[PDB]
Each structure stands twice: as C-alpha cells, then as structure tokens.
Amino acid sequence: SMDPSSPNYDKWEMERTDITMKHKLGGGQYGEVYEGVWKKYSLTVAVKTLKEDTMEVEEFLKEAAVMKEIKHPNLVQLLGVCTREPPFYIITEFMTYGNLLDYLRECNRQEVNAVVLLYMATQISSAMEYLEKKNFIHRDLAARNCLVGENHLVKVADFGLSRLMTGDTYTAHAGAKFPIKWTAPESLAYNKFSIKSDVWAFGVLLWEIATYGMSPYPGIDLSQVYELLEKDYRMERPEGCPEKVYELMRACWQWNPSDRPSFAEIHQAFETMFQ
Numbered sequence: 001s002m003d004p005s006s007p008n009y010d011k012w013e014m015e016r017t018d019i020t021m022k023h024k025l026g027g028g029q030y031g032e033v034y035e036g037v038w039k040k041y042s043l044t045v046a047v048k049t050l051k052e053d054t055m056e057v058e059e060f061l062k063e064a065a066v067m068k069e070i071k072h073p074n075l076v077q078l079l080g081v082c083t084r085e086p087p088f089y090i091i092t093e094f095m096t097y098g099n100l101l102d103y104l105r106e107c108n109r110q111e112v113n114a115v116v117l118l119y120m121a122t123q124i125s126s127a128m129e130y131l132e133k134k135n136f137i138h139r140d141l142a143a144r145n146c147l148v149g150e151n152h153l154v155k156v157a158d159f160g161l162s163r164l165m166t167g168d169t170y171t172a173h174a175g176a177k178f179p180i181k182w183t184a185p186e187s188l189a190y191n192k193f194s195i196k197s198d199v200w201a202f203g204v205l206l207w208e209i210a211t212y213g214m215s216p217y218p219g220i221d222l223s224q225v226y227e228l229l230e231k232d233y234r235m236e237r238p239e240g241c242p243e244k245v246y247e248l249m250r251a252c253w254q255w256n257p258s259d260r261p262s263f264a265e266i267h268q269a270f271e272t273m274f275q
C-alpha cells in the first residue's frame with residue numbers, strides 16, 4: 001500500500017518545495033551552497049545548487065551519484081536531491097560550525113583543547129579508513145574540506161575547492177594544478193594519486209589540527225616545497241603535540257608511498273597510543 005509503485009520513482013529525488021532556501025554559506029568561497037530548512041522535519045540542511053543549464057550538469061549529477069554510495073558517521077551525509085529539472089539541488093546534512101580550518105582558527109582553546117584535537121583527528125582517521133575500504137581516493141584531503149558539527153562532530157567532505165579558492169592555496173606545479181602543501185611528492189611529479197597520497201595529505205591535516213589551523217610549511221614559498229621534501233625536509237613537531245602523534249605524521253610523510261601506513265593502521269595507531 002505505502003510501497004512505491006510509479007514508473008519514474010527515485011528514492012533520492014525530493015520535493016523542492018519542502019526546502020526553504022536561506023543565505024549563501026562560506027561567504028562565496030565554498031561555491032553555490034546555501035543554508036536551508038527542510039520544513040516538515042524541523043531540520044536545517046545544506047543545499048548545493050546549480051542555477052540552470054550551464055552544462056555543468058554532468059559534473060553535478062556525478063557528485064550526487066558518488067554521495068549516494070557514501071554512508072559513514074564521519075562523512076558528509078546526502079539527504080536527497082532535486083535533479084529532474086533546474087535549479088538542481090544536492091541536499092546534505094548541515095554542519096553548524098562550518099569548515100574545520102576556520103573552526104580551529106576561531107575556536108576557544110579551553111573548549112577545543114588538546115584532547116578534543118586528538119579526538120577530531122580520530123574521527124577523520126575513521127572516515128579515511130572507510131574510504132580506503134571503499135577504495136575511494138579523496139584527492140584533496142585538508143582541514144578546509146572537513147566540516148564541524150555539534151559536540152565536536154567532524155566529517156570529511158569535498159567542496160571542489162580547486163575551482164573556488166582564490167589565492168596561494170591551489171597553484172601550478174610542472175604544469176598541473178595542486179594544493180601544493182597537501183600534495184604527496186609522487187603526485188606533484190607524476191600528477192597521479194592513490195590512497196597513499198591521501199595518507200600524505202592526512203599527515204598535513206594532522207599538523208593543521210595540532211597548530212589550530214596554521215598554514216603548513218610556515219613562510220616557505222610554494223615553489224620551494226618539492227625540492228625541500230626531496231632533501232628530506234619535513235615540518236617540525238608542533239608545540240604541545242605528543243611525540244607519538246608527531247611520529248604518525250612523519251609516518252604519513254615517508255617518501256615512498258609503500259612505507260606510509262594504511263588508514264587502517266593509522267586508526268589502530270590512535271587506538272593503541274596508550275599505554
């Protein structure tokens with residue numbers, strides 16, 4: 001009786017009218033993403049849009065397709081889509097405190113203390129263990145792509161920031177575009193990626209967390225990063241970072257991807273870090 005019956009049924013397709021669109025999120029730097037309220041469930045959501053036929057549709061539908069397969073407590077959750085006609089919507093759960101990078105930079109450090117930092121990292125570890133299980137390469141793992149919810153809930157996401165972020169975050173190396181300071185050496189030289197290149201990115205993220213959102217490789221110019229890494233230069237241990245978290249960072253930044261731990265081994269590392 002209540003079970004679906006009609007030929008064009010799609011369990012992900014939602015009633016546009018159920019959603020009231022509020023204002024743009026992330027002051028423009030995160031693309032066409034808005035706060036919304038799913039009316040009947042007294043639920044605030046995030047709604048990524050595509051105004052009309054810009055021919056950006058294929059890129060948008062593919063993101064939708066990806067998010068439908070992804071289900072984990074520390075990965076952004078798809079709630080529904082409006083993809084039968086424009087304006088196209090991707091509706092996800094709303095994460096109150098926005099991206100992790102700005103969160104860390106603006107937080108009260110007595111509340112977001114060293115224990116909370118370690119716990120946030122553990123949540124990211126678990127999310128990447130799951131992606132590794134699904135054999136999904138993130139490609140742009142970083143605090144700017146992590147989201148923070150209530151009670152220090154952290155979720156890995158991807159805003160497609162390489163086409164949105166102005167400045168010296170994403171630039172050219174050997175003629176290809178990278179977030180240079182989060183990119184594994186082999187990815188810079190060969191423009192290829194793997195689960196182990198996300199492992200390198202996770203070590204940088206660890207350093208971002210430990211420093212409350214400092215920019216990696218302080219002061220070092222972008223075009224200096226690769227040659228520095230090749231000589232075995234690695235970022236120093238942040239102030240107040242326990243040794244075993246720092247050795248995990250250093251394990252993620254092994255020159256050879258074969259020597260980097262798996263995300264499964266990274267999460268075990270957090271589990272056994274005491275005694």
Ligand SMILES: CNC(=O)c1cc(Oc2ccc(NC(=O)Nc3cc(C(C)(C)C)nn3-c3ccc4ncccc4c3)c(F)c2)ccn1
Binds near residue numbers: 025033076137
């Ligand atoms: C205040 N709070 C807020 O501002 C706020 C905002 C908010 O908005 C959104 C956050 C993320 C997404 N999208 C994704 O997360 N996509 C995703 C994840 C993955 C993984 C699985 C690789 C991580 N791949 N892709 C993904 C896949 C394909 C893509 N193709 C091109 C472009 C990007 C792509 C991303 C979104 F649509 C809306 C949510 C909660 N709070």
Ligand code: NA
Binds near residue numbers: 114117210241
């Ligand atoms: Na830490």
Ligand code: NA
Binds near residue numbers: 248251269
């Ligand atoms: Na280790």
